[PDB]
């Protein structure tokens, strides 16, 4: 029902008040009072808490409205309470946009981030975001009014001069209060993620086996590589053409056994490849050889030596010494899957930074979870009002206008998810990564604790 929807509203505003006001203000006290040094990150956390705290200080007024069913605080109260809510929206969305822009700058131009990430630049953008927020929410101070409707029942309702004004306000609120700032956020984090990304590695394993021993070693190093995130291509040397064979593979592993009667001869299937190994494109390519033999013969795995000699003479970068298996290969399986490990580490790409901003993407995602649905029903009510002129009713509008009343209560809830996220990510991982390591950070003024939470 319509009052059943309001039942969800009073609890959502109340639970947000219960989790928000203690949490957000505990954050503020531990920055003003506890931290004698307000760092750039702490200044951002403080303002994000101040924004969330202000909107929660008006929820009690909107509880009295839901309870008594009428507004008893006057025109100025209905004006002010909605104005400090609007600035809390525009501030929180541009402050998280700032955090995302500070992170892109830190990875894109590290010298410029080091140059401009000062407490002065912080206080300038913070005060700048605040001034920008106040003048973007002023339209609410004129579109809100207390109008008596039904007996002893007054509504703090948004009255517009026309549906064109209602449509402009809603699309302006949607664009300046979400679409435009979050478009800057997604572009930042897409570029941050487009840098760390890396195509999956491709490896080629061409083997020449007559009795199946080399085929076993090829298949075991193929399984070793594949389990480490490789795209292995295992081919018998009797079904391959030398022309452009290696083209496309970051790593090439050639295996072959020795088969000379009174000599060092190559395996039958491998001989045609070897004689045309120049057409493979081995020049400047990462390669490592393997193969089986028998120590009883005068030249143990002479095939591996001859192949490695040609690859070297063709300009190939031999990354590991040849894997020379004596006798039954499965009898030495660890030496095989261990040789494949060292080959990977010999060409392994640089270890990407293990400090990924999981906390800020949590703050951004949660903020997006509550405000994206609120701003699309704004756009949906605006698209209707721009032509259909429906408001508070309709066919889908009967469900849209009810959807706004639910998302409004959820908006008060978004103001209480940042402090729990601070503690959620903090205790969940730092305490789980050394309880003693945490105290050493907290023993100081407290600035190093916050910076470690934000990675
Ligand atoms: C057209 C309607 C009938 C829905 S109304 O619009 O008449 N409803 C109310 O007036 C209303 C009634 C009961 C109640 F408990 C709360 C509200 C309420 C409270 C605040 C706001 C509301 C609505 O809509 C905009 C903005 C959102 C916001 C932004 C930032 C943080 C949180 N919320 C903020 O100004
Ligand atoms: C006729 C013959 C000649 C061989 N010559 C050599 C050799 O010259 N050097 C060597 O290390 N092993 C030699 N071997 C041993 C093989 O390399 C060994 O059996 C190996 O496991 C063969 O592996 P594969 O056939 O599965 O590829 C020879 C084996 C045979 C049957
Ligand atoms: C619709 C109303 C809302 C308006 C929304 C806009 C708010 C301003 C946002 C970004 C401005 C800053 C963008 C540029 C920040 C990077 C500057 C930089 O990279 O610094 C290089 C400098 O030249 C080395 O000294
Ligand atoms: C303003 C946001 C700064 C980062 C945007 C950027 O440079 O990349 C955008 C690109 O389109 C994403 O791949
Ligand atoms: C959004 C608002 C951002 C306002 C930035 C204010 C100017 C920052 C100071 C500076 O550029 O030197
Ligand atoms: Na907020």
Author numbering: 13 to 212, 1002 to 1150, 213 to 318
Sentences from the paper on this structure:
Leukotriene B4 (LTB4) is a pro-inflammatory lipid mediator and potent chemoattractant acting via two G protein-coupled receptors (GPCRs), the LTB4 receptors 1 (BLT1) and 2 (BLT2). hBLT1 was first identified and cloned in 1997 by Yokomizo et al. as a high-affinity LTB4 receptor. hBLT2, which shares a 32% sequence identity with hBLT1, was discovered three years later and is characterized as a low-affinity receptor (20-fold lower affinity for LTB4). BLT1 regulates inflammation-related processes such as recruitment of neutrophils, monocytes, and T cells, as well as smooth muscle cell chemotaxis and proliferation. Various studies, including those using BLT1 knockout mice, have associated BLT1 with diseases such as asthma, influenza, arthritis, atherosclerosis, diabetes, and cancer. BLT1 belongs to the γ branch of class A GPCRs along with the chemokine and opioid receptors, among others.
To provide a structural basis for hBLT1 ligand recognition and a deeper understanding of its mechanism of action, here we determined a 2.9 Å resolution crystal structure of hBLT1 in complex with a selective antagonist MK-D-046, which was developed for the treatment of type 2 diabetes (T2D) and other inflammatory conditions. The hBLT1 construct used for structure determination was engineered to facilitate crystallization in lipidic cubic phase (LCP) by truncating N-terminal residues 1–4 and C-terminal residues 311–352, fusing flavodoxin with an arginine-arginine linker in the third intracellular loop (ICL3) between residues 212 and 213, and introducing five thermostabilizing point mutations (L1063.41W, S1163.51Y, A1965.53I, C2877.55F, and S310A; superscripts represent Ballesteros-Weinstein nomenclature). The hBLT1 structure in complex with MK-D-046 was solved in an orthorhombic P 21 2 21 space group with one monomer per asymmetric unit at an anisotropic resolution truncated at 2.9, 2.9, 3.6 Å in the a*, b*, c* directions, respectively. The hBLT1 structure, captured in the inactive state, adopts the canonical seven transmembrane helical (7TM) fold of class A GPCRs. MK-D-046, a BLT1-selective antagonist (cAMP IC50: hBLT1 = 2 nM24, hBLT2 = no ligand response), was modeled in the prominent electron density inside the orthosteric ligand-binding pocket of hBLT1. The side chain of R1564.64 forms hydrogen bonds with the carbonyl sulfonamide group of MK-D-046. The guanidine group of R1564.64 also engages in a stacking interaction with the imidazole ring of H943.29, which, as a 3N-H tautomer, forms hydrogen bonds with both the carbonyl sulfonamide group and the hydroxyl group of the chromanol core of MK-D-046. Among hydrophobic interactions, the largest ligand contact areas are observed for I2717.39, C973.32, and F742.60, with I2717.39 interacting with the chromanol core of MK-D-046, C973.32 with the pyridine ring, and F742.60 with aromatic rings of the benzamide group and the chromanol core.
